[PDB]
């Protein structure tokens, strides 16, 4: 309210179905803020970054100074950005905005400039090992009122060893376009059809693929090629009108500045938890808007419901909103995070609970100890370690 100094900043590691890492900031006034810090397959280094280094440095600080605190840790780290660093910084930022919206006694989205929309369009996944199988999952999710659907013919598998998947580009190219003809043939052009390419193709391959699918008018093709070299998207963009989305693996505006300003992409999928929190995400979204690039935040189960809360708040205000991904959470996971958001015929809403409108049931959570789970790696026929 007046000057809320931080009395404690605590890290919680729990596995209610999968691993989540959580930060809790408490002020002297007793206000609490929650932040997700989950980094899938590499959760603990982030727990450490916070527990051992950042949290002790939060104590005594005026929680009102979100920006100074962000700068302090972003630059003060000396070694800048990266996934572990930014997961930490984001967790803090998220928690501080929670607190601030509470101090203000409003739902966060009000603080960002209010609602730009009445609801947040979300999209879901279809899983099947044949055309017929997918066609059904689609039918199913349609009926549940989803207006956007991701077609593909828990990723982080328990077991301290990453599972190794064989991959062939040639086959994927020849078949996948068939997958979409089918979905359009059967269901018409009524829902938004999304597709994730999982970083598997070289640029000229991703170019051919995009062309190969223009007839089916995808809402987007995602993560066409590894994007560490942002110029690699140029070849795709000059050869196809299939929209491009990328960015779930990005942790900073520096990862995507060139992709945006060269207009190489249509949707930016950076997330509150990995790309610098509310503070970072606002800057990314606003930058994107200059180039008519829209938001399409990554939303799998490996970002905690805390992140989902913050994302929905962000999504209701942000002018250049595109879509919000909504893989699900098991009931088991949701129980650990009492929420207050709503889902209604394809659209979500963060609700009107002050702050993020989210909770963390520590006692429940403290009953699921951390349990090692890792994302798969991909190799080619010949063993070449590839992009998963």
Instruction: Name which of residues 223 to 242 contact Mg ion (CB under 5 A).
Output: 223
Q: 36 among the known binding-site residues?
A: no
Binding segment toward Mg ion, per CB under 5 A, in 105-113, 121-129, 216-224, 260-268:
216-224
Question: Which one of Mg ion, a second copy, Cl ion, none is in contact with 106 (Cβ closer than 5 to 8 A by kind)?
Answer: a second copy
**Which residues are designated catalytic?**
198
Residue 300 C-beta: closest distance to Mg ion, Å? 8
Q: How far is the CB of 57 from Cl ion (least distance, A)?
A: 18
* Under rule CB under 5 A, residue 302 binds Mg ion: no
- Any known ligand binding at 248? yes
Minimum Å gap between C-beta 224 and Mg ion is 10
As a residue count, the chain comes to 388
> Per CB under 8 A, which of residues 72..111 are in contact with a second copy?
72, 75-86, 100, 103-106, 110-111
The strand ranges marked E within the chain are 6-14, 20-27, 32-36, 120-127, 148-152, 157-158, 164-167, 192-196, 220-222, 244-246, 267-268, 294-295, 324-325, 342-344, 347-349, 373-374, 377-380
1 contributes a contact to a second copy by CB under 8 A = yes
3-state secondary structure of 108: helix
Estimate to the nearest angstrom the gap between the alpha carbon of 30 and the chain centroid.
30
| 60, 8 Cβ separation under 8 angstroms | no
65, 111, 174, 219 from 142: Cα distances, Å: 44, 34, 27, 16
Contacted by 196, from a second copy, Mg ion, Cl ion, none: CB < 5 to 8 Å by type: Mg ion
Positive/negative CA dihedral, 79, 84, 86, 90: negative
CB distance 148 to 192 below 8 Å: yes
Site of tokens 């930016």: 268
- Which two structure tokens, joined as six digits, stand for 63? 């929680």
Residues 87 and 39: their CA atoms lie apart, in Å, by 7
Rounded least distance, CB 138 to a second copy, Å? 17
Rounded distance between C-alpha atoms, residue 361 and residue 335, angstroms: 8
Could you say which of a second copy, Cl ion, Mg ion, none residue 13 binds, taking C-beta under 5 to 8 angstroms by partner kind?
Answer: none
45 binds a second copy, rule: CB under 8 A: yes
Choose the one of Mg ion, a second copy, Cl ion, none that binds residue 49, judging by a C-beta under 5 to 8 angstroms depending on kind.
a second copy
Q: Judge whether 298 is annotated as a binding position.
A: yes
Instruction: In whole angstroms, give the CA distance from residue 28 to residue 46.
Output: 26
Question: Counting contacts by CB under 5 A, is residue 85 touching Cl ion?
Answer: yes
274 labelled as ligand-binding?
no
User: In terms of CB distance, is 72 or 137 closer to a second copy?
Assistant: 72
**Contact at 8 Å (CB) between 225 and 199?**
yes
- 185 annotated to a ligand binding site: no
DSSP one-letter code for 53: I
Nearest partner of 126 among 182, 206, 200, 201, judged by Cα: 182
Q: Which is nearer to a second copy, 80 or 186 (CB)?
A: 80
User: Residue 232 interacts with a second copy (CB under 8 A)?
Assistant: yes
154 binds, options Mg ion, Cl ion, a second copy, none, Cβ within 5 to 8 A by partner type? none
Q: Does 325 bind Mg ion (CB under 5 A)?
A: no
154 is in an annotated binding site: no
Q: Is 249 among the residues that bind a second copy (CB under 8 A)?
A: yes
Q: Are 194 and 148 in contact (CB under 8 A)?
A: yes
Q: How far is the CB of 155 from Cl ion (least distance, A)?
A: 20
Q: Using CB under 8 A, count the residues that bind a second copy.
A: 122
Nearest CB to Cl ion, comparing residues 88 and 333: 88
Q: 206 CB contacts (<8 Å, ≥6 apart)?
A: 197, 221, 224, 225, 235, 236
Annotated binding site: 40, 125, 196, 222, 248, 269, 298, 302, 325
Binding site for Cl ion (CB under 5 A): 82-85
Annotated binding site for Mg(2+): 196, 222, 248
Return binding residues for substrate: 40, 125, 248, 269, 298, 302, 325
């Amino acid at each position: 309210f007046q000057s809320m100094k931080i009395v404690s900043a605590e890290v919680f590691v729990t596995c209610p179905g999968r691993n989540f890492v959580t930060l809790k900031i408490t002020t002297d006034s007793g206000l609490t803020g929650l932040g997700d810090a989950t980094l899938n397959g590499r959760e603990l280094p982030v727990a450490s970054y916070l527990n051992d280094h950042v949290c002790p440095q939060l104590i005594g600080r005026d929680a009102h100074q979100i920006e100074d605190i962000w700068q302090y840790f972003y630059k003060g780290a000396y070694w800048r950005r990266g996934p572990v660093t930014m997961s930490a910084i984001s967790a803090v930022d998220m928690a501080l905005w929670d607190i601030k919206a509470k101090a203000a006694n409003m739902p966060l989205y009000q603080l960002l400039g209010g609602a730009s929309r009445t609801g947040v369009m979300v999209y879901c996944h279809t899983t099947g090992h044949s055309i017929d199988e997918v066609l059904d999952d689609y039918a199913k999710h349609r009926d549940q009122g989803f207006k956007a659907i991701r077609v593909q013919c828990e990723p982080a598998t328990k077991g301290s060893l990453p599972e190794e998947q064989l991959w062939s580009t040639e086959k994927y190219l020849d078949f996948t376009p068939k997958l979409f003809e089918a979905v359009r043939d059967k269901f018409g052009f009524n829902e938004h059809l999304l597709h994730d390419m999982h970083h598997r193709l070289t640029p000229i391959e991703a170019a051919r693929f995009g062309k190969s699918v223009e007839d089916y008018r995808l809402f987007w093709m995602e993560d066409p090629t590894p994007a560490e070299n942002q110029a690699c998207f140029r070849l795709i963009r000059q050869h196809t009108v299939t929209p491009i989305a990328v960015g779930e693996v990005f942790n900073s505006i520096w990862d995507c500045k060139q992709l945006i300003e060269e207009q190489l992409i249509d949707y930016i999928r950076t997330t509150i938890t990995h790309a610098g929190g509310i503070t970072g995400m606002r800057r990314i979204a606003d930058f994107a808007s200059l180039y008519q690039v829209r938001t399409g935040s990554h939303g799998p189960s490996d970002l905690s419901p805390i992140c989902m809360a913050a994302a929905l708040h962000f999504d209701l205000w942000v002018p250049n909103f595109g879509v919000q991904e909504y893989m699900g959470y098991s009931e088991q996971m949701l129980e650990v995070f009492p929420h207050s958001w709503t889902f209604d015929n394809g659209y979500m809403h963060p609700g009107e609970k002050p702050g993020l409108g989210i909770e963390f049931d520590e006692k429940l959570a403290a009953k699921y100890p951390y349990d090692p789970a890792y994302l798969p790696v991909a190799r080619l026929e010949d063993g070449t370690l590839w992009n998963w």
